[PDB]
Amino acid sequence: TARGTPSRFLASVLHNGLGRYVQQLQRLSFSVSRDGASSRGAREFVEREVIDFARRNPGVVIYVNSRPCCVPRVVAEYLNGAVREESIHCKSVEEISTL
Amino acid sequence: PPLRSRAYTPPEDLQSRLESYVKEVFPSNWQDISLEDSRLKFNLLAHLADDLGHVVPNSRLHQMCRVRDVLDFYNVPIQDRSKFDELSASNLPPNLKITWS
Amino acid sequence: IGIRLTLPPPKVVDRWNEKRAMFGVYDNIGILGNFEKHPKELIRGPIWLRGWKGNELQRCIRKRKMVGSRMFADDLHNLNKRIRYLYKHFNRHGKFR
Amino acid sequence: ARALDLLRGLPRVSLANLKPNPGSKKPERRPRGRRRGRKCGRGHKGERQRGTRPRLGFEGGQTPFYIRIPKYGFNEGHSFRRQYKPLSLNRLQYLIDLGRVDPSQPIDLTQLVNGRGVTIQPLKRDYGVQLVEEGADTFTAKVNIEVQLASELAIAAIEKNGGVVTTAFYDPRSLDIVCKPVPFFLRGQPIPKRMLPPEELVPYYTDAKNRGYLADPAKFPEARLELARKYGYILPDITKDELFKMLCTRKDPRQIFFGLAPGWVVNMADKKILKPTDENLLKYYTS
Amino acid sequence: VKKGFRAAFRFQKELERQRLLRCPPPPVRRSEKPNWDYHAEIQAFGHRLQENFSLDLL
Amino acid sequence: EPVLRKVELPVPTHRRPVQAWVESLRGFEQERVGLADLHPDVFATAPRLDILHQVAMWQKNFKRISYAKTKTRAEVRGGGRKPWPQKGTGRARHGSIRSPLWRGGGVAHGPRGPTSYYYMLPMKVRALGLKVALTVKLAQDDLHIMDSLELPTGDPQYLTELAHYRRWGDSVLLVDLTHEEMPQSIVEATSRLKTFNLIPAVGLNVHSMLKHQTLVLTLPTVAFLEDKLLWQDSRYRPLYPFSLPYSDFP
Ligand SMILES: [Mg+2]
Ligand SMILES: [Mg+2]
Ligand SMILES: [Mg+2]
Ligand SMILES: [Mg+2]
Ligand SMILES: [Mg+2]
């Protein structure tokens, strides 16, 4: 609800489009379990979708590791310091690509 | 005790080597020899696997009707690289880092 | 509050003890044994339920018939009351006639 | 095959992978939520909801439908009206062709059942088989069939091809023995002796028109020639047949199996047949 | 004791979350937390701005 | 010296048999000792995993008695008298201190008595499941064949090492013909181990096969299996239980 929620004003990071557009996401960490059943969509994404995404976005450093051992997750870090986690456990490859 | 590797590299002279073995057991047009007989099928495949270090799987012994099919099967290689080392072998872009152990 | 705070002790299950490693063995004693025995003849359990199924009323009736005369007095009286009630319910109450 | 090739490149099958066939395991219904349960489907207040509505068929006091319609003996006696399982000639031919019954051997009830040609239920007041005329055309077989009834058309169909048909009788106690003999030989009882028909049926089994097993075996030729003369064929002389010795064979009354005498005891464990010798026992059985 | 494990672990995670709002950890270099390789990071810093920095000088 | 084996029962004229290697346990590198032929309808049926599911679920549930009882409202101690009159006081109406409502009362709808869950599938379905399991464990390079389960010495280390040498898997289900004729070495070795299980052919079942990864039959066992499982297609409907004597059925 509005009253029960924070708010802000419409803004950008560093006047992004003024001089030159810059892509805010700068780091992306994938944790994908090599065995877990919930890490199936994640394994598909890494096996046949992460290379293309890396090529299309060369300003984002993508790390992927295989030591959650039961649950995957993607942690996105931005230029302005903000972090943002998203669950990719029990999701399809389409859903992970869209996310 | 020293475990054997699944990796198989089909030799270039295979089509020649195979024929030597055929001469040991069985005319022209040998690609179409039938193997409904089982004694000779066993002798041939045992020789081939003792040489090339590769036995046919039980799931592919009824798909080998003719020696042509044996040649076809021996023309496909097997990779002994798990996803571990196939991921970090595709000239990853510089901005993607994988970690394995 | 109705939620525990510390984590429970880990329930370690040994998926390869004798009872699990040999489950189901001899469940085709009939088909693979010239039909000398039948699968039901491996069901270990109550005298009145080995190889039979039914709703509660039939189960209680069967218990009464086969071990009713071996039951303790109070258990047997409870069983008779239960049969009486179930009869009334299954034969007079319900959505469907 | 094709699918067996698919399985090679899929993960190993195990108890972690199984599934029910879609459409089989219909989901369950429980009264929880705003849809399933607020009154859980039972409706407004009223004896419908409480589970106390009258017995099945109570029309609210108006005289029920199944009580305002008079009684009539549509079913009186039904437990004693005897029943017979039809054995159409179509079915007999079909069984002969595929090698289930053997026409080079007398066809009794035992050999109809041991070939799974008909299913006899003694306990439901089936007394035996009745040949029915269906398929009289296209029936071409030389069979010595012993049944428990026969329409005259079936008698024709069996004669026209040089065959003998005889209507026997079996009482409810011996019919079970003849239909499923191996159980009886397991019980250990000595073979009983067939009872004679009831009062109402002797005029049936003592008439040549029906090839009865108690009618005199001298009025038969007149019946056979009469049937042939009515149905426009020539009664073949069976006496010259290559295996007429077989078409002649018959079971005398008071016998269940062909080569077994009432009073014997079959020992299947040792492959033996035990016969009595006390004079009183023989007297009782031979009658 | 209610028998189970999922609710217990869920509550532990929620407690940890609350314990990382009060008493937040002393902030530390991003070059010490996990998932860090300097080379990829500096090259990405280059490519992000649309500039061909010489790697040694940068 | 090869050890061949032909299929005995008739094959339909439109299907060729399937084949498999015949290995030995007498040595680490004694695979491909011979070549064996296997009847198509028992080792190459349609995959049919859903039947495997039906059979495994029956094999789980048909032998279950649930020993859970909860005292109904009339089986709990006491509870006869009306606690307080209906009209006078200001409390809720109650006609016993043992209703389900009250603390310490009885369950309105709870596990009643020991419950049986038994049911039997058509025998043909269970035989079909056996055939499906065998063919799936063949198609996926998991079924093996052995001339015999003989071993050089009963030391379990040898058997587990050998199973490691050939990518058998975590667990092996060895099947022999009769419980009395299993050789001394294999029975001694497989008593100590945990994931290796030795059963006689009469005990083969779907669940115990889908559990273990690798299935290792002796040759007499495959003969026995072909005989006993091909008997189901092309048999009459029964006239009485097959335990009673029949003309042709041992
Ligand atoms: Mg329900
Ligand atoms: Mg009135
Ligand atoms: Mg009471
Ligand atoms: Mg009351
Ligand atoms: Mg209580």
UniProtKB/Swiss-Prot annotation, chain A:
One of its GO terms (cellular component) is mitochondrion. It is found in: Mitochondrion. Keywords: Mitochondrion, Ribonucleoprotein, Ribosomal protein, Transit peptide. Signal peptide: none annotated. High relative levels in skeletal muscle and testis. Lower levels of expression in the heart, brain, placenta, lung, liver, kidney, pancreas, spleen, thymus, prostate, ovary, small intestine, colon and leukocytes. Expression is coregulated with TWNK. It comes from the Eukaryota. GO terms for molecular function: RNA binding; structural constituent of ribosome. One of its GO terms (biological process) is translation. Component of the mitochondrial large ribosomal subunit (mt-LSU). Mature mammalian 55S mitochondrial ribosomes consist of a small (28S) and a large (39S) subunit. The 28S small subunit contains a 12S ribosomal RNA (12S mt-rRNA) and 30 different proteins. The 39S large subunit contains a 16S rRNA (16S mt-rRNA), a copy of mitochondrial valine transfer RNA (mt-tRNA(Val)), which plays an integral structural role, and 52 different proteins. Belongs to the mitochondrion-specific ribosomal protein mL43 family. This is Large ribosomal subunit protein mL43. The lineage of its organism: Eukaryota, Metazoa, Chordata, Craniata, Vertebrata.
From Swiss-Prot, chain C:
Keywords: Mitochondrion, Ribonucleoprotein, Ribosomal protein, Transit peptide. The keyword Ribonucleoprotein applies. One of its GO terms (molecular function) is structural constituent of ribosome. The keyword Transit peptide applies. One of its GO terms (biological process) is mitochondrial translation. GO terms for cellular component: mitochondrial inner membrane; mitochondrial large ribosomal subunit; mitochondrial ribosome; mitochondrion. It is found in: Mitochondrion. Component of the mitochondrial large ribosomal subunit (mt-LSU). Mature mammalian 55S mitochondrial ribosomes consist of a small (28S) and a large (39S) subunit. The 28S small subunit contains a 12S ribosomal RNA (12S mt-rRNA) and 30 different proteins. The 39S large subunit contains a 16S rRNA (16S mt-rRNA), a copy of mitochondrial valine transfer RNA (mt-tRNA(Val)), which plays an integral structural role, and 52 different proteins. Interacts with OXA1L. Belongs to the mitochondrion-specific ribosomal protein mL51 family. This is Large ribosomal subunit protein mL51. The lineage of its organism: Eukaryota, Metazoa, Chordata, Craniata, Vertebrata. The chain holds residues 32 to 128 of 128 of the full protein.
Curated annotation (Swiss-Prot), chain E:
It comes from the Eukaryota. It is found in: Mitochondrion. It is linked to Combined oxidative phosphorylation deficiency 16: An autosomal recessive, mitochondrial disorder characterized by hypertrophic cardiomyopathy, liver steatosis, and decreased levels of mitochondrial complexes I and IV in heart and skeletal muscle. Belongs to the ribonuclease III family. Mitochondrion-specific ribosomal protein mL44 subfamily. Component of the 39S subunit of mitochondrial ribosome. May have a function in the assembly/stability of nascent mitochondrial polypeptides exiting the ribosome. Component of the mitochondrial large ribosomal subunit (mt-LSU). Mature mammalian 55S mitochondrial ribosomes consist of a small (28S) and a large (39S) subunit. The 28S small subunit contains a 12S ribosomal RNA (12S mt-rRNA) and 30 different proteins. The 39S large subunit contains a 16S rRNA (16S mt-rRNA), a copy of mitochondrial valine transfer RNA (mt-tRNA(Val)), which plays an integral structural role, and 52 different proteins. This is Large ribosomal subunit protein mL44. The lineage of its organism: Eukaryota, Metazoa, Chordata, Craniata, Vertebrata. The gene is MRPL44. The chain holds residues 31 to 88 of 332 of the full protein.
From Swiss-Prot, chain F:
It comes from the Eukaryota. One of its GO terms (biological process) is mitochondrial translation. One of its GO terms (molecular function) is RNA binding. It is found in: Mitochondrion. GO terms for cellular component: mitochondrial inner membrane; mitochondrial large ribosomal subunit; mitochondrion. The keyword Transcription does not apply. Its main location: mitochondrion. The modification Omega-N-methylarginine is found at R103. Keywords: Methylation, Mitochondrion, Ribonucleoprotein, Ribosomal protein. Residues 74-105 are annotated as: Disordered. Belongs to the universal ribosomal protein uL4 family. Component of the mitochondrial large ribosomal subunit (mt-LSU). Mature mammalian 55S mitochondrial ribosomes consist of a small (28S) and a large (39S) subunit. The 28S small subunit contains a 12S ribosomal RNA (12S mt-rRNA) and 30 different proteins. The 39S large subunit contains a 16S rRNA (16S mt-rRNA), a copy of mitochondrial valine transfer RNA (mt-tRNA(Val)), which plays an integral structural role, and 52 different proteins. Interacts with MIEF1 upstream open reading frame protein. This is Large ribosomal subunit protein uL4m. The lineage of its organism: Eukaryota, Metazoa, Chordata, Craniata, Vertebrata. The gene is MRPL4. The chain holds residues 45 to 294 of 311 of the full protein.
